[PDB]
Amino acid sequence: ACPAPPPGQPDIRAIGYYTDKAGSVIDPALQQQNKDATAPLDRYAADVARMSDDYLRNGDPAAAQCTLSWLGAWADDGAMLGQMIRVNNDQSFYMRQWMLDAVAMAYLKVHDQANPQQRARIDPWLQKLARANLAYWDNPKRRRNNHYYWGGLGVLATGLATDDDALWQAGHAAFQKGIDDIQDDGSLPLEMARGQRALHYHDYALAPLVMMAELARLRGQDWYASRNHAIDRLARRVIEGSRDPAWFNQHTGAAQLPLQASGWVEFYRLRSPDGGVFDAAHARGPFHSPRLGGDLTLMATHGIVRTP
Ligand SMILES: O=C(O)[C@H]1O[C@@H](O[C@H]2[C@H](O)[C@H](O)[C@H](O[C@H]3[C@H](O)[C@H](O)[C@H](O)O[C@@H]3C(=O)O)O[C@@H]2C(=O)O)[C@@H](O)[C@@H](O)[C@@H]1O
Numbered sequence: 001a002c003p004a005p006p007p008g009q010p011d012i013r014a015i016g017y018y019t020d021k022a023g024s025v026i027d028p029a030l031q032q033q034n035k036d037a038t039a040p041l042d043r044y045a046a047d048v049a050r051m052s053d054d055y056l057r058n059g060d061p062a063a064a065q066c067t068l069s070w071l072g073a074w075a076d077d078g079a080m081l082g083q084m085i086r087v088n089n090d091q092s093f094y095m096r097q098w099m100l101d102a103v104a105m106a107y108l109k110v111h112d113q114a115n116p117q118q119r120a121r122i123d124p125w126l127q128k129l130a131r132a133n134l135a136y137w138d139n140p141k142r143r144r145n146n147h148y149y150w151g152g153l154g155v156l157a158t159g160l161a162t163d164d165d166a167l168w169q170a171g172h173a174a175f176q177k178g179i180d181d182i183q184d185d186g187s188l189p190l191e192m193a194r195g196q197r198a199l200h201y202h203d204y205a206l207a208p209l210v211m212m213a214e215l216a217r218l219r220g221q222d223w224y225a226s227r228n229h230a231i232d233r234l235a236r237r238v239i240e241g242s243r244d245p246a247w248f249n250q251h252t253g254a255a256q257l258p259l260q261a262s263g264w265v266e267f268y269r270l271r272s273p274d275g276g277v278f279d280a281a282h283a284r285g286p287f288h289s290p291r292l293g294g295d296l297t298l299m300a301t302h303g304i305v306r307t308p
Contacts, residue, residue, distance in 0.1 A: 056306060090136075
């Protein structure tokens with residue numbers, strides 16, 4: 001009934017594909033190279049997202065058991081615990097953050113179906129990945145942009161799922177720095193340097209901050225207020241921006257590519273409706289993002305976990 005997972009590959013060889021300082025102009029060949037190189041890794045994320053999605057949607061323990069089986073198999077095969085091969089950037093390192101986000105959110109969603117044996121295999125694997133990811137951001141030489149907020153999510157979810165309180169404080173630190181990076185105009189200095197993709201990267205930075213906030217809401221915290229409701233400013237700046245890019249066009253000097261707000265809106269519309277600014281974007285749903293935890297619509301309506 002539970003199909004065979006792919007072999008957990010120890011090595012990642014992804015490929016950065018922007019050709020300009022702003023990281024805004026794509027080389028299509030390079031975009032294709034990286035896509036084919038990562039396509040197996042992305043198939044796995046989507047599968048555990050969907051199977052964990054199937055469990056949250058209809059309560060079937062087989063969907064949760066098949067998810068635990070697949071995560072069980074990847075831990076055992078030491079998946080992505082090897083070399084992050086550098087082709088032309090740290091693209092392989094980023095994938096290990098994104099994959100951790102996908103595999104740890106999937107685990108959290110089915111964790112109440114887990115028995116001690118499956119816990120024994122998965123936790124040390126997630127924790128190895130989560131500590132490996134944190135240890136990249138120990139170097140001060142590396143700009144803590146949206147990549148740091150995306151790393152933060154997996155580390156936080158691994159902290160919550162494995163109940164590793166060091167990892168949770170690390171995750172929270174990532175979320176703190178994101179909120180702290182929000183200027184009074186709702187903008188992020190590091191994301192403002194992405195020319196025509198500036199608005200995309202604002203939406204892209206915000207989504208993992210919103211997911212971390214929603215993870216804190218599972219532990220009975222409320223991070224949303226931090227720094228005098230700073231997240232609402234960035235939220236406003238992105239949702240106003242998907243409607244009207246004039247501010248981003250003026251502030252960066254680049255004509256923005258059109259953006260449709262990502263699945264962070266499914267939760268955020270419930271936390272602070274702001275008149276209902278997210279209603280058009282919500283109507284574009286459901287939102288599927290394995291890197292953010294899968295079906296954001298289902299999780300916003302019915303919760304990330306079926307029981308605390
Ligand atoms: O075709 C898609 O839309 C593709 O998007 C994928 O996620 C992107 C993500 O949107 C984001 O742009 C990210 O950007 C990185 C970039 O890869 C590079 O490393 C740069 O130096 O840093 C950027 C950054 O985050 O600051 O790249 C993601 C990626 O995988 O390249 C996926 O959502 C994919 O499933 C989708 O089809």
